[PDB]
Design a protein around this nucleic acid. Structure first.
Ligand SMILES: [Mg+2]
Ligand SMILES: [Mg+2]
Ligand code: NA
Ligand code: NA
Length: 326
DNA sequence: CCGACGTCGCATCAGC
DNA sequence: GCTGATGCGAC
DNA sequence: GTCGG
């Protein structure tokens, strides 16, 4: 539905979600505001009153009321006032730095640090991740067109295969659902030598990708998960590509396809797939599908050899990644 | 009236 | 030193 | 903030 139907309402709601999360530290209100923003975004009629909104699942009495106020005045007083509040709009802004959450943002604003300028003058007060976040602030908010993703995927598959031709790599994310652009790259990796009934497999890959200068920085690295930055090589006399978030995960063979499904998303689709899963006597997380017991007894992980197997157990025609928006 | 609201890997903090 | 809790990011 | 036991 066209964003101009209830656009003003959903932006109001998402703005209020943001303050709950970043300023009030009320994650459950943040998610309530987003849930109500979603169901509104999908509603195919121009909302004429709060009582009308109220009908939607996730819209309660207090949002109904804010809708009424927004309809009559084109604004909300509470939102107007929070915006002109220096302390609160600073705290809210700084959370846009990857690695500064509600709690570090609060701490900074308490002691005078409110702007990227302030963050720059105070490197010593930021942790490693936060420096990388600061350094790529601009880059990190940009989107990645598919063309650069395919190019990034070329590097990844080439280098992974070079390290050891028995690795299996799948770039997931909205990339995998065929999206026209993506916010980051999410690589899932496994290896025949790695099951769960069983720390270099990850490091070796990360290492090759730094060696060809594809990975430029590291946010975190452990035995199973890497979070980092990458950058395509620059064209011959051209302006350089932006720096990009890339994650690389190592998953045991018998959990690979649950992982692929889970990180393929979208979350909306996974919420559905989880719900239907429950409906037919099964539970599915990122690691496994388990049958529910005569009492709610999730039992042993079942054998899984492909995405299909999963879909099979819960009796769903396998859904092509391109259809997994919902 | 009141508890649930996904869960988890890693970096780092708090406390012993 | 170590263990556990907290912050963070993220389908 | 909203839903539902
Ligand atoms: Mg070989
Ligand atoms: Mg992703
Ligand atoms: Na409702
Ligand atoms: Na942040």
């Amino acid at each position: 539905p066209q964003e101009t139907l209830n656009g003003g309402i959903t932006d109001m709601l998402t703005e209020l979600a943001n303050f709950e999360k970043n300023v009030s530290q009320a994650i459950h209100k943040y998610n309530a505001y987003r849930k109500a923003a979603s169901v509104i975004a999908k509603y195919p009629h121009k909302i004429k009153s709060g009582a009308e909104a109220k009908k939607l699942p996730g819209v309660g009495t207090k949002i109904a009321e804010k809708i009424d106020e927004f309809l009559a005045t084109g604004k909300l007083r509470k939102l107007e006032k929070i915006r002109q509040d220096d302390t609160s709009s600073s705290i809210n802004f700084l959370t846009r730095v990857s690695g500064i959450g509600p709690s570090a943002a609060r701490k900074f604003v308490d002691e005078g640090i409110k702007t990227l300028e302030d963050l720059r003058k105070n490197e010593d007060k930021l942790n490693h991740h936060q420096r990388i976040g600061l350094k790529y602030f601009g880059d990190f908010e940009k989107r990645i067109p598919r063309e650069e993703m395919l190019q990034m995927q070329d590097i990844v598959l080439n280098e992974v295969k070079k390290v050891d031709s028995e690795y299996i790599a799948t770039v997931c994310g909205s990339f995998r659902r065929g999206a026209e652009s993506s916010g980051d790259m999410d690589v899932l990796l496994t290896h025949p030598s790695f099951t769960s009934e069983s720390p270099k497999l990850l490091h070796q890959v990360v290492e090759q990708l730094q060696k060809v200068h594809f990975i430029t920085d590291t946010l975190s690295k452990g035995e199973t998960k890497f979070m980092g930055v990458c950058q395509l090589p620059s064209k011959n006399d051209e302006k350089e590509y932006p720096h990009r978030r890339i994650d690389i995960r190592l998953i045991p063979k018998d959990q690979y396809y649950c992982g692929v499904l889970y990180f393929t998303g979208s979350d909306i689709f996974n919420k559905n797939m989880r719900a239907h899963a429950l409906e037919k006597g099964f539970t599915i997380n990122e690691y496994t599908i388990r049958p529910l017991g005569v009492t709610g007894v999730a039992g042993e992980p079942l054998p899984v050899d492909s995405e299909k197997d999963i879909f099979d157990y819960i009796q769903w025609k396998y859904r092509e990644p391109k259809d997994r928006s919902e």
